[model samples]
Target: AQYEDGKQYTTLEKPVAGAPQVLEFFSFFCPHCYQFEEVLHISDNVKKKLPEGVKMTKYHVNFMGGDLGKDLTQAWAVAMALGVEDKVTVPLFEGVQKTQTIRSASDIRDVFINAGIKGEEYDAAWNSFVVKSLVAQQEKAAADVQLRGVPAMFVNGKYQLNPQGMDTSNMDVFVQQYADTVKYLSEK
Candidate 1:
């Protein structure tokens, strides 16, 4: 009953172009982001609530893996380009946050290979112009937001959900409000 602008969410200085778009910024190395995927499955739950014509875009943040940040983002871009996010996102998250694996680029490639993608295909996507451009876009998008944390969700590239303002007494309420806010903001 109390989701207000500047409290529950903040408007972006420069709004992104796509209407009815939900952009999620997350880092592979973030434990909370991983938990959201593995334990809470918040993303899937929220996706179910989004209204029709809404497209959810996931962007990998570039500030976490140090020199390996770009590499991780590149791998994400590759997964996206190949339309294999369902195969790699959780594994990559677990690799980075849960297991002590996925230290280098080769480890990431191996994840895709294990997911049934051919090694050459993954290598091709990794070195493709589309993936390179996507990686650059992810880096710039993260920097443009001046983002300090992962698992940030923005609706229509304008309003960012503030978890601090949400009633997080439990996962049910939190996911419901989070979904309502996205649905509300997408129309605005």
Candidate 2:
């Protein structure tokens, strides 16, 4: 339960109320974020170690794709609102980074539709207040954290993870350490 405060993680100015929540700041355009999802599967591993009722939340940062950033954020909000993140996250990343098929809002719409989501559902969510507010909140969170890059994780909304300080020699050891730190911070 003990770790260096400033070195391993930085304590936030204001602590969030939700304990054991991991808020991830990432952009689909970034190759590193894609690797974190498809290669490392950090969130899946971390989820197994979290106690009951704990969850990992994602905030798609709107700073990477120029004008396309905002659209991506909105698209992500729509995905989350529709409870299809498990279906669309990898596809979105692959479309944007691997295949470069996602270049605009309509392209995002296509991904949702292709994933078996009704076009009406996508359209409704896209224009709904729920999606808009989620997008707004995502941008606000990034600003509040003074985030400068993608693939950042904050545990309990206070401890901003410093992955550079964790063991990166192997994936198994790294994931265990990362999950342990999250567990320790969540209990704090």
Candidate 3:
């Protein structure tokens, strides 16, 4: 995953894996991510409809950081490391979406706490080497892809599903179509 130095790129890297993987790149701040949240919730249905080898994973894009980004990403990494990634998705998304008014680390911490994830565990996971490394991986991937925005989906490292290009009026159909595209690509 290489890019032109000065030119900004709006893409995401899909790491090669044995199973056909659907890598979705998204940011908490992006409205598009919010729009696609429901689709993500129904990902199990999407997976059930997919070919045998296909799977789904999320990569949170963190271009907006300061204390908020750091805290948010830290929470994400912590959840993953703690083996509670699935448990934290809804609360994490809510926190990110609600962060428009509250944009501080402590505020974000409260969001996690309210979501049932303890602040102490969150802090510990956030500071773990594995979590930090994953965060760094996301940062490098973002830079390499030269991402301009959020809510981008990558299918098998070859194709990307851009939400901006889809019909927002019927997002369910659009997301299903996107899943179909992945199923189609998996055969090739």
Candidate 4:
């Protein structure tokens, strides 16, 4: 699970405690990732049925379009720093996907503000250590994983699925199968 210090693909240091680790790599502007959100909801439902301690974490990839990507990376980092990742991530994603909002740093900030975070707090957190660490972690993850696309997921550091290999037509079924695969691996 080791990763570079400042890359987009850096791995989380802690293995997901008692649960099988599930990491999803996505991008804000990726239509495929947006589609995958539907599957994520299904995954959430499946998670409730699973034994306690299963963990799911998401990392937004940001290397496709230079500044735009960097901005997204920064915004996500800020959210992480503010401890409002849940608050901002979804809204930001929805803003990008549903509203025709431009995907820029300002747009991300706007989403954060609309999500109930203070503007000054968000700005400070964006530049804080947590955000910086996350940015670095992202860079590290990208370099370590050598990722090439969005909506990619890894289970327990081994199995992986990308948009190309997923059957989005039956998203819940596919996601459940994938989770089961991870559960099986964990037992092994």
Top-lDDT structure, candidate number: 2
TM-score of structure candidate 3 = 0.75
- Candidate 2 has its poorest 10 consecutive residues by lDDT at 13-22
Model 3 stretches with alpha carbons more than 4 Å out? 1-20, 39-45, 65-67, 98-101, 164-166
In the range 1-188, model 3's lDDT, one tens digit per residue, is: 22221221223344444323676666666666665674444355457677776567666766665567666766666766777766766666666675454467776666667768787888877668888898876666555445666766556665555444444577567666556655655554
Q: What stretches of model 2 exceed 4 Å from their correct place?
A: 13-20
lDDT of each: 0.82, 0.86, 0.61, 0.64
Instruction: Give the per-residue lDDT of model 2 (tens digit) for 1-188.
Output: 35988766889888766433788888999887898899888888878888888878888988899888889999999988999999999999999998999988899889999999999989999999999998988987887778888889998778988788887889888888887888787788
| Candidate rank order under lDDT | 2, 1, 4, 3
Ranking by TM-score: 2, 1, 4, 3
Per-candidate TM equals 0.91, 0.92, 0.75, 0.76
In every candidate, how many clashes are there? 0, 0, 1, 15
Cα error of candidate 1 at position 109, Å = 1.2
Task: Return the TM-score for candidate 2, rounded to 2 decimals.
Answer: 0.92
- The CA root-mean-square deviation of candidate 4, after full C-alpha superposition on the true structure, stands at 7.2
